[PDB]
């Protein structure tokens, strides 16, 4: 974990003295207000600073320097100026997505290393824009700005040699900016290593609550009821959307299809699904094609608790713990309760320390 | 305690709004011909009714629905054409038959949630929290003509009414909820809005105002580019 | 370990009676004789049959089930007549890329789901294309062929319901193929209840043995002199392509450094480095651009033994079994034996029961 | 016996053909240019001789690299390119000075090779050694063709090579001669259309023709020369 050394934050695109083209690109597509680190960080970047930013993804870390580079990037020039390097082609083709969808209406070539050396921008992984750079494939000379994206990613899936190699077949002069969640020995070495007084920069995960949700329960009482009383629940309040729980992906599953039956529109989510499919599901689900998402309790960690009003603990969960990151922050928690379900109610009122009151008959205005 | 407990045909007061509910709550782009059939199938309980009392509720209730919840208005709309569409001719008002009839509910619905207005500026709070709610429906109202406009499910003269209710709070330092709805609408029913029953010359007024709200109003960057993308979609690009 | 029960092997693509537009299309990609499988499985699949494949990855899997797709394609048909599946979109795509390849001479549109109702061939991941069927995207009327590629890979990443769904959301007559390394339990169940008399192929992976190459040695004494040994070993014999082995990682990049610096091009993979990485670095060096390639001992099972001419080991294998794996079957071995290596040689001598002569001055001529 | 490991400079015969491996070795479209250098430093040790022996040692070297790896044969058509051009101007041979003096060389080192001949159809012994001179005669004809398109031989070399693939194409050819004239064709077909020719490749697709419409020949190889036929007379290169 390292120190923040930094303060001057930016709350406004409109005070970042960006480019209409880029200022145009950024709000048509969704920015409308900077994130933490977009606040802290993407000023510094443009300014010319070496960047060192401890951040975790979902941050806004991609468009962070994404938005920075571009303002920093000359149209008149068709040559690579800034080079940005990821651990994974996956995450190396996002960036380029989310750099040229910002770059819509700016004249700025994106390319793709996994006809290069007339892009403005370049975008890959560290064995891939190595063996680029020594088929003199590439023009490295115009290069300013060397972003490194998801460091100890990249050091942990042994790219170590061929980073440093990059960092010496570029301008001695250029920029360099690093972002990474973790800061640990080998990430630190090449900080100190390759980057110049670097504007150092730590955004800390923020702290999840209970104060901003209200919380009841509703006493099944048996295991059978538990479909019921959600069908019912359904006939009595207003829902935009809704998020359910369960313990076991089986339950999950299950509750899926006799919702499908009742004609729901429902997304599910579990653990033995890849990181790729959730994110589909999740992104599919945010975006209003379907209505309900039940998901398994072991991905409530990695899962984003967006404006969607209602969350249902259709199980109650096993690990106490795992209470806070399913209805963590204004919405609303509804617990779905049995006769022995009741002591375990009674564990996660003691743990937070928060009440829980029983479903009142005037949700339809609440 | 005071709580809350679970549990050819006709339906009454309470069982139309639970049913109604239950069936708006699911209206997605994939169940829809599922659920939108089985919302018709309680409109059409009207045909054994004098003043056709249910099929009035389910208008309202819909209207509700596309008012709290905008992302959806477009659907919501659609919903409503299909009812229109294919409702059971043999249904009297004894208040015009069939489509005729759901158009001019659709028509009185709009007066009736429309003169209940609202404000533009808004003083956490008590009352607050209900006058900002009574925006959010407002305007989430104007979006949900738009959607019924296109689909020719309305007539002109609501639709002018609608852009009369928003020039007249765009002249009073709109606030950008409502600069963010007007651009929406233009976008939505803009072009089709050009030719209507002295139309063109309603957005030449329109226009105007925007291009004042431009050059002076301190609006923030995002919302002057919307204005100035609308203000060249008609004057310039003509809509294409 | 399921048993074969279909006898009819056709050793040439000639004799599959293909139409001309796709046997342009397999011949101009590379293709000129049928793998073990695409020599027992394609006419079958041609045939109408359904057929179970127990095959590993890289044996022509993809190549087999893509070329008899194409043939039953009816190119009047403007709709999805074949469902191709696989475990991720990168497998999904790759699939694509060689349908599309087959198909360069033919009139057949492949999309990819993870404007797809007017396609001939839809490749996927099991919930994309389940979600896309459910939301009545694309026309699945017209269907007739159903290929599951990998089925325990997809089955181990949660995609059970989903498969199962498909199943019965195709046309009840649509022939099922299914391709898979291992045949678990899970894999079985979904082959008895949705397959029809399988054809049942089963391709055993081929042994490796010494037979098909010379060995020898060379006793450079001392560690120090190992790379000496190898720079002169160049100037006494012509090469065309090399592999060098090293036990650790660490070696391995510094001996490619060093060969570097004495205008060597090579390429280097270990443990550390992503697939996708590795795969690359291989397919690039098997293309000419590199002609020393350095790996580690780690990587000599999941490793490709092309008609590269020479493997030196420059380490001697810590771990006597990966000798074969190493240079296993036409081809010339030479091993680097230090004074302290000597028992270690011993130890391959009697363990394999070969023989390894020390290496000749008559080498330019062998 | 075993194995032992070890202008300002000279090399003797065994030094030079020691470090040519090793470059030749090392021969890459990434390295060319530092490795073509060095390659082009040996060759200039001529300048301190009267017969030129170890420039014509390069060229022999460089022909019999090409002709064990077709798959760099123009690369190895290239070094020769940049060998005539870059070539000191002050070498004198005993037997036309600079580049002159290589293109020689160049013509000389293929009516050697070629000389040597080879067989078409092959019958464990001696036949490791009859498949390697087809081979390694196959991979000259290809090579030959690389230096006929940077215009490093003339169209005599040209001409004498289609003449032994024509004579040797009208005997039940193999599938890997068929396979050499159509790599040629494609790689100097358009350019020997015209040269001290067009009438020739009307023989030599004339045979094709007829291979085409009697030989019993794989679907791939009867598509290759389908194509190539269509690409000259249709076409038009
Ligand atoms: N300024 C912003 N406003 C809203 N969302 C953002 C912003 N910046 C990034 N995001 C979202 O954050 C997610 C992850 O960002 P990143 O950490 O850059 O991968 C992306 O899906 C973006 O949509
Ligand atoms: N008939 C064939 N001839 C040569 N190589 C093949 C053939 N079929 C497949 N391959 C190669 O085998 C690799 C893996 O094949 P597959 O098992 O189909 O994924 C691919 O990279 C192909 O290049």
């Given at each position: 974990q390292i120190q923040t050394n930094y303060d001057k934050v930016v709350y406004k695109f409109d005070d970042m003295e960006l480019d209409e083209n880029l200022l145009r690109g950024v709000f048509g597509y969704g920015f409308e207000e900077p994130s933490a680190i977009q606040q802290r960080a993407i000023m510094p970047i443009?300014?010319?600073?070496?960047?060192?930013?401890?951040?975790?993804?979902?941050?806004?870390?991609?468009?962070?320097?994404?938005?920075?580079?571009?303002?920093?990037?000359?149209?008149?020039?068709?040559?690579?100026?800034?080079?940005?390097?990821?651990?994974?082609?996956?995450?190396?083709?996002?960036?380029?997505?989310?750099?040229?969808?910002?770059?819509?209406?700016?004249?700025?070539?994106?390319?793709?290393?996994?006809?290069?050396?007339?892009?403005?921008?370049?975008?890959?992984?560290?064995?891939?824009?190595?063996?680029?750079?020594?088929?003199?494939?590439?023009?490295?000379?115009?290069?300013?700005?060397?972003?490194?994206?998801?460091?100890?990613?990249?050091?942990?899936?042994?790219?170590?040699?061929?980073?440093?190699?990059?960092?010496?077949?570029?301008?001695?002069?250029?920029?360099?900016?690093?972002?990474?969640?973790?800061?640990?020995?080998?990430?630190?070495?090449?900080?100190?290593?390759?980057?110049?007084?670097?504007?150092?920069?730590?955004?800390?995960?923020?702290?999840?609550?209970?104060?901003?949700?209200?919380?009841?329960?509703?006493?099944?009482?048996?295991?059978?009821?538990?479909?019921?009383?959600?069908?019912?629940?359904?006939?009595?309040?207003?829902?935009?959307?809704?998020?359910?729980?369960?313990?076991?992906?089986?339950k999950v599953e299950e509750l899926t299809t006799k919702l499908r039956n009742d004609k729901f529109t429902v997304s599910a989510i579990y653990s033995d699904l890849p990181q790729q499919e959730r994110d589909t599901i999740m992104k599919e689900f945010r975006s209003g094609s379907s209505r309900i998402l039940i998901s398994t309790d072991l991905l409530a960690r990695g899962i984003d608790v967006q404006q969607v009003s209602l969350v249902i603990n259709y199980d109650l969960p096993a690990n106490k713990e795992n209470y806070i990151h399913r209805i963590g922050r204004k919405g609303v928690a509804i617990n779905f309760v049995t006769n022995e379900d009741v002591g375990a109610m009674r564990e996660l009122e003691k743990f937070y320390s928060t009440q829980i009151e029983e479903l009142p008959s005037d949700i339809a205005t609440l | 305690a005071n709580r809350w407990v679970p549990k050819t045909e006709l339906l009454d007061k309470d069982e139309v709004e639970r049913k109604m509910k239950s069936l708006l709550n699911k209206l997605t782009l994939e169940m829809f011909d599922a659920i939108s059939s089985e919302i018709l199938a309680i409109a059409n309980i009207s045909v054994w009714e004098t003043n056709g009392e249910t099929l009035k509720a389910v208008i309202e209730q819909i209207f509700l629905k596309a008012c709290d919840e905008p992302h959806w208005s477009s659907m919501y709309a659609q919903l409503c054409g299909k009812v229109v569409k294919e409702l059971n001719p043999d249904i009297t008002d004894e208040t015009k038959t069939g489509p005729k009839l759901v158009l001019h509910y659709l028509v009185a619905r709009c007066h009736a949630e429309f003169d209940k207005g609202w404000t533009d500026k808004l003083p956490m709070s008590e009352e607050y929290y209900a006058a900002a709610s009574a925006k959010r429906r407002g305007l989430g109202?104007?979006?949900?003509?738009?959607?019924?406009?296109?689909?020719?499910?309305?007539?002109?003269?609501?639709?002018?009414?609608?852009?009369?209710?928003?020039?007249?709070?765009?002249?009073?330092?709109?606030?950008?909820?409502?600069?963010?709805?007007?651009?929406?609408?233009?976008?939505?029913?803009?072009?089709?809005?050009?030719?209507?029953?002295?139309?063109?010359?309603?957005?030449?007024?329109?226009?105007?105002?925007?291009?004042?709200?431009?050059?002076?109003?301190?609006?923030?960057?995002?919302?002057?580019?919307?204005?100035?993308?609308?203000?060249?979609?008609?004057?310039?690009?003509?809509?294409?």
């Open positions: 443009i300014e010319g600073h070496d960047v060192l930013a401890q951040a975790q993804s979902g941050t806004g870390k991609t468009g962070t320097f994404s938005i920075a580079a571009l303002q920093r990037i000359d149209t008149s020039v068709k040559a690579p100026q800034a080079l940005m390097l990821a651990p994974t082609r996956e995450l190396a083709l996002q960036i380029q997505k989310v750099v040229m969808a910002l770059a819509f209406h700016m004249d700025i070539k994106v390319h793709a290393c996994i006809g290069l050396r007339d892009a403005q921008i370049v975008v890959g992984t560290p064995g891939r824009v190595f063996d680029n750079i020594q088929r003199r494939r590439f023009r490295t000379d115009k290069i300013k700005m060397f972003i490194l994206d998801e460091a100890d990613e990249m050091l942990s899936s042994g790219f170590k040699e061929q980073i440093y190699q990059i960092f010496t077949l570029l301008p001695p002069t250029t920029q360099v900016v690093l972002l990474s969640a973790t800061m640990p020995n080998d990430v630190l070495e090449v900080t100190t290593k390759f980057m110049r007084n670097p504007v150092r920069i730590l955004v800390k995960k923020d702290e999840l609550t209970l104060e901003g949700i209200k919380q009841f329960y509703v006493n099944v009482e048996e295991e059978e009821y538990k479909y019921e009383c959600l069908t019912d629940l359904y006939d009595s309040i207003s829902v935009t959307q809704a998020v359910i729980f369960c313990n076991t992906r089986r | 109202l104007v979006r949900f003509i738009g959607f019924l406009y296109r689909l020719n499910l309305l007539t002109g003269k609501m639709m002018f009414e609608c852009f009369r209710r928003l020039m007249k709070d765009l002249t009073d330092s709109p606030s950008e909820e409502t600069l963010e709805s007007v651009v929406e609408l233009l976008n939505t029913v803009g072009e089709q809005f050009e030719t209507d029953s002295e139309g063109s010359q309603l957005l030449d007024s329109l226009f105007g105002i925007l291009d004042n709200i431009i050059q002076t109003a301190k609006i923030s960057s995002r919302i002057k580019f919307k204005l100035i993308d609308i203000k060249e979609l008609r004057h310039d690009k003509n809509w294409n």
